[PDB]
Each structure stands twice: as structure tokens, then as C-alpha cells.
Write a protein that binds this ligand. Structure first.
Ligand SMILES: Cc1ncc(C[n+]2csc(CCOP(=O)(O)OP(=O)(O)O)c2C)c(N)n1
Ligand SMILES: Cc1ncc(C[n+]2csc(CCOP(=O)(O)OP(=O)(O)O)c2C)c(N)n1
Ligand SMILES: [Mg+2]
Ligand SMILES: [Mg+2]
Lengths: 557, 556
């Protein structure tokens, strides 16, 4: 009772709630894709290019747990490389599957099709090894089932990319289907009691001794499923709690102890002080600190920092390998109320929930928009924002509870969010078809990955594509080169993008005024994810949220 | 008298006749880019994405000698890699330049310890690398990089920290060129090679000449033309070298493509007992659609690199110089040949209605009526790559078919780069592109960049409702070979074009009304020609061989 290894892979991917398969076909993955259509539940997105496909996989994996992209040897896998790199950097389980020529007999199939010339056919594997948690290149059908299972486990558990090469000749070879009747084991190994024990007691004594602590949640908080444990910590301590831009949504923001988003130097004065004055910081799922961008500087003042991570825990300079975020937090939640004992709940910072009313002819400005979006959002929504003026603006928006944010702030691939929006939309559809996916992308970033809108159209997905037209690269104009050619772009007809890519059931509308915006976003028809929609939001050419142009004068000579 | 290292770099690129510069602005190359507008006669393309930029740079270098793309640390360089990788495979001098951060400690985008990973990666697909850390050496290093790029015609990685580009060095340096010459061979090796070849020619009952890409690429175009005049052996071209032999020469026999060639040509080559190959990329390689190899082992490969005979590599023997020595004594050595008459493709089509629906085999013949000396002809992996092989190329046609590395989307970019290079060579030199409905989706946005720089290429899009080469080699009706449907005609105005033409052609007459029209024939504005075509239609050779190869039990 036997199935192909092709079939075997997809059946395993289905058992881990992975239903949509990303990539483009090529010379050596065709038979493999044949297998998708034999598995009730699966489907082939069939993307517009391999980078967009990887970005989409990033986005799917963020919502769903993990994701799969398939490319062909050489031309394919190398096109995805930057997509994977950002996935590696922001800890996102993408399984990258690459079909390759037959391991034949003197590898004489593998060698002839290898057109790169240097006679070394492993080069592309090597290359991906650098930006993968592990790799695998199946040469042996007897080990293939357990190797695949391993590749999948590692993707889901470590939440980082994994390279898995399947030679064409092996995806048609067969195994026992019986194998599928035992699940892939995705459980975490329990912690070392000696190190856990010792971590906890160090952490409690740090709390006990602390006059002004803060809690701070980052990307891995969500990624490694510790939202509940983090909420409990906030609850049991009543400490002031913050999110970084990249774990926005990891704390339900209607919580009275939640004090908004820390963005180092771009933070609002109140929040900057709330965090920088802290004599102890409890980082959950920190995605490194003390790091810079060309627009902001992120770090804390205290050295009295406790980072929980998936792999390990960190306390001041001490490192405790195999002391795992989830279990460590669970254990802490037993003694922690008591260590918190003598904390006096200071009230904390709040952004304004609402914009004061103005004339409906009022020109749209970014500071205004980022607030007004607070009014449009509903619980369950997915909000995606591009590196740009968006990635710093959505930081002041009040999110309903149960709202996932996608903001690839650390790696900072632009155009990322177009592909991410595809993946996020496929996953939402699979999770709950009433779940809205809202994208905020600048007109300039959109050019890099524009064609993956075709692929949204093709599956009649219904994301809202909000396109901030402010005539160019407006954040890279605020730091260096205000009026250089290299931060100028061609002016596209954003409203014709959907029709041009063959959309038959869409809406496409410009908004330039406060009143235009309100008429569109309060329309109950619009508020329901009925068809795919694009909104061209017109903004001034040197506009930005207010704490960014804080640092056009006050840290640029 | 002093200039920033930045300016030195651009001043060196001008001296080598690089005028357009490719890539996207980044966190750590902005300072570098500032310099460009101060060197007169230099421009920044402003590409729509990095991969596109690399493809453009490829196209540029193919025409203008060499090229330069600037990306930024991590996000930029890695986005460009598939582009660099093909430049490496098909031997094209692209200088990849990455602005990186400035002897820092924390800025690292990834999240290991490792400032060096993306350089390690680009090493695997570069002739050399260079990560400049010290001002005193940097000019010397830049020159090596630019030299190596040009001389070897393979891409080179050049990492430039942000601190050093604003540091400053003496203008005087520019007053010496860069050494872009070779040095004649070691005459010991040359003689040994030339001799055995001349011998082999005498013994050769029926020799043949192959030009491959490195023939254009390393300037051996003319030497090939004499050699064919003197040996009057049948001459042929690889799909990668089409246009290296001007196709009017009596003894030019068309395009050898291994298992996909025209029966007459397949016969001509498979039965030679000596192959004189000028500038092979690969002798013996496969793709999904065909299989390349000669039948003799009695093969001479001339490269710039080396010379090779049967199994014997003679490192040293440079293909340009060496070929002159053969030119002399060959006149003699070969004059016991009985000139075998050379195969031909239909040079014109048979008259038919004007309502006769368009068909690939018709199109590729007809294209020959539209072309003209000086033209540039670009063909994308897919039906278009194979179709053009049938087309008759006017003298001094330059061809770009990326048939070895075979990355779809390549062309949209290469088209931009070529049109920049074209412009800088001759206003009136047209740039013509055939690309599939499906390939275009991968790289469609680089059209914006064409519009913006007021370039006027011809963009023939083959609209055959999907990936049709793919359908012919597995999955004729598979959803994965289908593609979302685009208003191709609306693509220009939608990317904000103003001086533009966009027309559909469905029928043999419609194609004629358009390509015969005199104004069309002038590179006045950017034009896009949607060519309607049956889904499963394709050059008749390739329909055969996609059946043949599926009829055998023999495998991959
Ligand atoms: C792949 C890549 N290339 C270049 C950059 C550098 N970069 C960062 S932001 C930016 C401008 C983004 O444009 P847009 O979305 O229009 O910004 P807005 O006007 O909304 O701020 C650029 C060019 C990058 N991050 N990634
Ligand atoms: C980057 C990349 N992705 C995927 C492939 C595999 N591939 C080869 S040909 C092809 C289809 C080309 O489509 P189209 O241009 O319509 O071809 P035509 O209809 O002219 O044959 C694909 C997807 C590739 N060669 N390169
Ligand atoms: Mg913009
Ligand atoms: Mg096509």
C-alpha cells in the first residue's frame, strides 16, 4: 500500500495545516507538482516570480505556523534567496523545496543540466545552507521519509527556513503510505530542571530588587506561541507592557497595563521615558537589541535585561542554553506574583484613541491617517505595513484585540509586503473567510513586487491594498538626498493595476481628503471583505508620521 | 588635487565606456551614488528592483563591453544573485558593487555573528571578490576588479564600506589607464597547438566551424570570418552565438542546437570528423527541451582563457592571438577540401490571405523581412528562443538569447540595459524583443524604467495563454503551466507612459500592415505588440523533439 515520495511530502504538509504551496514550476519539479492535485486540501498558488513567492511563503507561515515554497534548480532557488534571508532573520518557518536533476549514475544527469559551468553542482545548496536552520538533499529512498519529516519538524519547531533538495528521480519512487499514520513529532524537549530552576530564581530575585520594571514583547513572542504566557506575566505583575514594532499584536492592546510600542529613538516622549528609565526589562522573544536602521536606533539604558528566547534565556550577560521560552515562562508564572508583591502600579502612556473632527475637505496627512485607521480595524484583522513611512506610522495605531501585525522591520526588504499580503490572504481564507487582510504600502515599494497582485486576482482573494502615493521614496528622502534622482520613481496609474492584471470583480478608488477617507471606510459595504480593493491614498511629497520628522532636524546636521 | 574614492570609481567606469549605472539606492550606498551626477556623461538608471537591475546590467555589458550594478548590504545584493549567476554562466563582465557598513563594532541585517556571509555567498558566482578596508590599497584593488571584470568577462564582487567612499585620494591616478591588454602567448605552447590543429585539418575529411558566445564576447568575430573564407568549411552558430557569424556569408549553414536542429543541419554537424569551435561556453550540456554534444571527439575549443584539443587543455593559449597564427598557414593546410553545399531555412514565406491566423513557424521566417543591419535581437527562454534560430539575421545583427542559463524574466531587464547601451552607441540602432506572456510577469516592472528614460525598444509579447514550452515537455493541461491573464496593451499607459504605441496582431495580414509601415520601422517611441497565438503552437522542430524524447524509455 504505497505512494510516491512526491505524494508523501504533500500529505505531510497537509497534516501540519499547510494547504497552499508557493513557487514557480521549472525543468525539475514538474512531476512533483503533479502530486499536489492528488491531495484533497492542497493547491498551487502559481506565483508571478520566485522572490514574491518567498515573500508570500513568509507571510503564510506567520499566520499558519509554517509554509512551503518550491523552486527549480538554479534559476529558481537563487531568485528566492533574499526572501529566505529575511525569513531566516525574522525567524519564520519557510520550508524551501528545490527540485534538482537525477542523482543518476556518475551524476551524469546532474552534471549536464548544470549550466553554471564550474562543474560543482552543490553550489546552490551550499549557498542556501548559510541562511537555513538545516538542509537536506535526498539521495536515498529508504531514509527519505524520515529526512522529510525532520526537515518539516525543524521548520515548525525552530521557526527558521530549511532547504530540502528532491532529485527528480526520487519524487517518483515510492514508500509505504502506512508511514503517514504516525504524525510528525513537533513536541519540544522539556527543559533542563537544573538550568530552568536556576534561571527562574535569578529572574525572581531581579524582580524583587527592581523599583521600576517594564515588560516588552517582540517577534518570537507570537512566533513561538507565548501570547497567553506573556499576557499572564503582565496580569500577575501588573508591570507596564510594551511591544516592539515587529511583535505588534503580541499583546492585546486593550489591556490597561499596555503602554504602546517602543521604537527606540522614534518612540513618543512618554514611551521613550517609560522604557528608558526602566531598571529591569523583561524581553519576551527578543529579536536582538542595540541595533540600528538609517532612520532609528533601538536599545535600552539599563543592563538589567532578561531576554526569553525559544532556544535559551539571557540575564545580563549570562546565557542559559536549552531553557525554552514557553516552559520557562509557564514555570515563572507560579512564583512571579509573589516576587512582584511590592510593585506600585504607576499609570502608563496612551496615544489618542481618536482624531478631533475637521472639515471634510481637509487634506490627508500621515499623522492623521495613522490614527483614523484605529477606527477601521476590527478584531481578527491582519495588518501589514511596508518598511517606509508606513512601518513607523502604524506604531501609533490602536489595534483591536486578536490583531496580527506583519512589519519586516529588521531585514527591511522593500516590496516584501506585496508577497506577504498574498500569503497572509491565503492563510486567512483557510483559517476564517471573514478575516480581513489590510496592507499599507508606499507607491515606491510597490514597484519591486507589483505583479504578485495578479496572483491575488487569480484566486479571488479579497485583501485591501492601501497605496500611499507621496511621489517617491519619501523616508530615504528624510535622512539623505531630499531631491536626488535616485529617490524619484515613475508615476503609475494605481487605479488601473487590478484591471490590467485581469481583475473582473474589484474596486479601485482614490482618497485625498479627510472626508473622502471617512466616506470610504465607514461604508458598511466596503468594511466587509467582499472583493479585492485598492485605495490610492494621496499624501504630500515630504510627509511622514510626527516622531520621524522629529529626527529630520534633531539628529541630522 | 583630490577626489572621493566614490568619484574615482565612477571616473574609472567612464574611462572603460560604462555610462549607465544599475541598481537600487540603499542604507549603505547613498554616498556612493551621490558621486554619479558629478561625473558628466554618467547616469543612474533607477531600476524598479535589484534582480531586474542585474538582468539589465547583463544586457548592457553584452553590448558595451562591461557594466556596473550597485546594490546594498544583504537585501540588495541577495535580490540580484540570480542575475549575477547567469552573467557568470554565460560569461558577461558585470561589476557587482555592494555598499556595505563602515568598520562597525550590530548593524548586521541577518542574526548570526557574521558580517561576511553575503560576500561568501557571492564568491561562488564571481571571478574574484574584493572587500576594501584600507584607502591606500583601494584604488589599486578597484582597478584589478574593473580589469578582471573586462578581461575575463565574468562578474566580480566589489564591497565598498560607507566610511571609505567619502575618504579621498589623488586625481593623478586616473592619468594612467587600467591595463586592459593581454600579453602574447608563451610561443612554445602556441606553436604546439597551432601545429596539431593544422595537421588535424588536413586529416579532416569533413570539418565544420562553430561560433559560440565567447566569439563576440572576446572580440574574435573578424578572425572567425577570415578562417571561414580560407577553409570554406561549413560554418555554424550556437543559439548563444547567433549573429557572431554574419548570416549572409555563402558558407554559413544556420544554427546548430543538438537534438533540436533542422534535420539538414543536425546531419551536417553530427557527421563532421572535426569541429573548430570558436569560444564555446559549453560543449556537451542538456536542458529540459534539448541536448547538446558533437559526435566526434575530434574537437578544438578556442577560448580567451586557453586552447583545448580532444582532451588536452593548453592553459596559456589565448583565442584572439592564436587564431591569427592559424589564419596564415590554414589557407595552405585546408586546400584539399571539396566545398560541401550548406543547409538553408526558408528565406521568405508563401503568400497567403490576410485573415490567415498567426502561427509560430510563419512568424520567425517573416521577422527576417523586418530586421536590418545594426539591429539588436533579444529572445526569451520559451518558444521565442527557439523560433528565432529559423530567422535570417541581416549583417551586423547582435543577438541576446540566454539559452544556456535560461532564466525567464531575464529579457525585460536585458532589454533595458541593451537600449541604454544602444543609445550610447547610435540613436538610430533599434532594440527588438520577443518575450512570452508568462516570462514577462516575472520582470514586468522594468518597463517603467524604459518609459522613464524615454527609451524606444520594440516589445513583441507572445500571448499564447500560458507557459507553452513547458506544456510541451510535461503537463499540457496542468494548472501550474496556466497564468493569470493580463491586459498587455494596457501595460504601457498603466506604468505612466505618454509617448507610446500598443497594438494587437492576430493574423498574418495584421502583422504585415504593421511591420511594413514605414513609421513603425523607425525607433521613434516605445512600442508593445501583443502577438496572439495558439496555446500549443511552437517552432515545428521543437514540437517533434518534445514528442520523441517522451516516446523513449530513456530518462533523466
Ligand atoms: C530590496 C531593497 N532595496 C532598497 C532598499 C532601500 N530602501 C528602503 S525604504 C526605501 C523607500 C521605500 O519606498 P516607499 O514605500 O515609497 O516609501 P514612503 O514614501 O511611503 O516612505 C528604499 C529605496 C531596501 N530596503 N530594500
Ligand atoms: C526564474 C525561472 N523560473 C522558472 C523557470 C522554468 N520555466 C522555464 S520556461 C517557463 C515558461 C515560459 O513562459 P512563456 O514565456 O509564455 O513561454 P512560451 O509560451 O513563449 O513558451 C518556465 C516557467 C525558469 N527557467 N526560470
Ligand atoms: Mg512613496
Ligand atoms: Mg507564452
Amino acid at each position: 500500500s504505497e505512494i510516491t515520495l512526491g505524494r508523501y511530502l504533500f500529505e505531510r504538509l497537509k497534516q501540519v495545516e499547510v494547504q497552499t504551496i508557493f513557487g514557480l514550476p521549472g525543468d525539475f519539479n514538474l512531476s512533483l507538482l503533479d502530486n499536489i492535485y492528488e491531495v484533497p486540501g492542497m493547491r498551487w498558488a502559481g506565483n508571478a516570480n520566485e522572490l514574491n513567492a518567498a515573500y508570500a511563503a513568509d507571510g503564510y507561515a506567520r499566520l499558519k505556523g509554517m509554509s512551503c515554497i518550491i523552486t527549480t534548480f538554479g534559476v529558481g532557488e537563487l531568485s528566492a534567496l533574499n526572501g529566505i534571508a529575511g525569513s531566516y532573520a525574522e525567524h519564520v518557518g519557510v520550508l524551501h523545496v528545490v527540485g534538482v536533476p537525477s542523482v543518476s549514475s556518475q551524476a551524469k544527469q546532474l552534471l549536464l543540466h548544470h549550466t553554471l559551468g564550474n562543474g560543482d553542482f552543490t553550489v546552490f545548496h551550499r549557498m542556501s545552507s548559510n541562511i537555513s536552520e538545516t538542509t537536506a538533499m535526498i539521495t536515498d529512498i529508504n531514509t527519505a521519509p524520515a529526512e522529510i519529516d525532520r526537515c518539516i519538524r525543524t521548520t515548525y519547531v525552530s521557526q527558521r527556513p530549511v532547504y530540502l533538495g528532491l532529485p527528480a528521480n526520487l519524487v517518483d519512487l515510492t514508500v509505504p503510505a502506512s508511514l503517514l499514520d504516525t504524525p510528525i513529532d513537533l513536541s519540544l524537549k522539556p527543559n533542563d530542571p537544573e538550568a530552568e530552576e536556576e534561571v527562574i530564581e535569578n529572574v525572581l530575585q531581579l524582580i524583587k530588587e527592581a523599583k521600576n520594571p517594564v515588560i516588552l514583547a517582540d517577534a518570537c513572542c507570537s512566533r513561538h506561541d507565548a501570547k497567553a504566557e506573556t499576557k499572564k506575566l503582565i496580569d500577575l505583575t501588573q508591570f507596564p507592557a510594551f511591544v516592539t514594532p515587529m511583535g505588534k499584536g503580541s499583546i492585546d492592546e486593550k489591556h490597561p497595563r499596555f503602554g504602546g510600542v517602543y521604537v527606540g529613538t522614534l518612540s513618543s516622549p512618554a514611551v521613550k521615558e517609560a522604557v528608558e528609565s526602566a531598571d529591569l526589562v523583561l524581553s519576551v522573544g527578543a529579536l536582538l537589541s542595540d541595533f540600528n536602521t538609517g532612520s532609528f536606533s533601538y536599545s535600552y539604558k539599563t543592563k538589567n535585561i532578561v531576554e526569553f528566547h525559544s532556544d535559551y534565556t539571557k540575564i545580563r550577560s549570562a546565557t542559559f542554553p536549552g531553557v525554552q521560552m514557553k516552559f520557562a515562562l509557564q514555570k515563572l508564572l507560579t512564583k512571579v506574583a509573589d516576587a512582584a508583591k511590592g510593585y506600585k502600579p504607576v499609570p502608563v502612556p496612551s496615544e489618542p484613541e481618536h482624531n478631533e473632527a475637521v472639515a471634510d475637505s481637509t487634506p490627508l496627512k500621515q499623522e492623521w491617517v495613522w490614527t483614523q485607521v484605529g477606527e477601521f480595524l476590527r478584531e481578527g484583522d491582519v495588518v501589514i505595513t511596508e518598511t517606509g513611512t508606513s512601518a513607523f506610522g502604524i506604531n501609533q495605531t490602536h489595534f483591536p484585540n486578536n490583531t496580527y501585525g506583519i512589519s519586516q522591520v529588521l531585514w527591511g526588504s522593500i516590496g516584501f509586503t506585496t508577497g506577504a499580503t498574498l500569503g497572509a490572504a491565503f492563510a486567512a481564507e483557510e483559517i476564517d473567510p471573514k478575516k480581513r487582510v489590510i496592507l499599507f504600502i508606499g507607491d515606491g515599494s510597490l514597484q519591486l513586487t507589483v505583479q504578485e497582485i495578479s496572483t491575488m486576482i487569480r484566486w479571488g482573494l479579497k485583501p485591501y491594498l492601501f497605496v500611499l502615493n507621496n511621489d517617491g521614496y519619501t523616508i530615504e528622502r528624510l535622512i539623505h538626498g531630499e531631491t536626488a534622482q535616485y529617490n524619484c520613481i515613475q508615476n503609475w496609474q494605481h487605479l488601473e493595476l487590478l484591471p490590467t492584471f485581469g481583475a473582473k470583480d474589484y474596486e479601485a478608488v482614490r482618497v485625498s481628503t479627510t472626508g473622502e477617507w471617512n466616506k470610504l471606510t465607514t461604508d458598511e459595504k466596503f468594511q466587509d471583505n467582499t472583493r479585492i480593493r485598492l485605495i490610492e491614498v494621496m499624501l504630500p511629497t515630504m510627509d511622514a508620521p510626527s516622531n520621524l520628522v522629529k529626527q529630520a532636524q534633531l539628529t541630522a546636521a
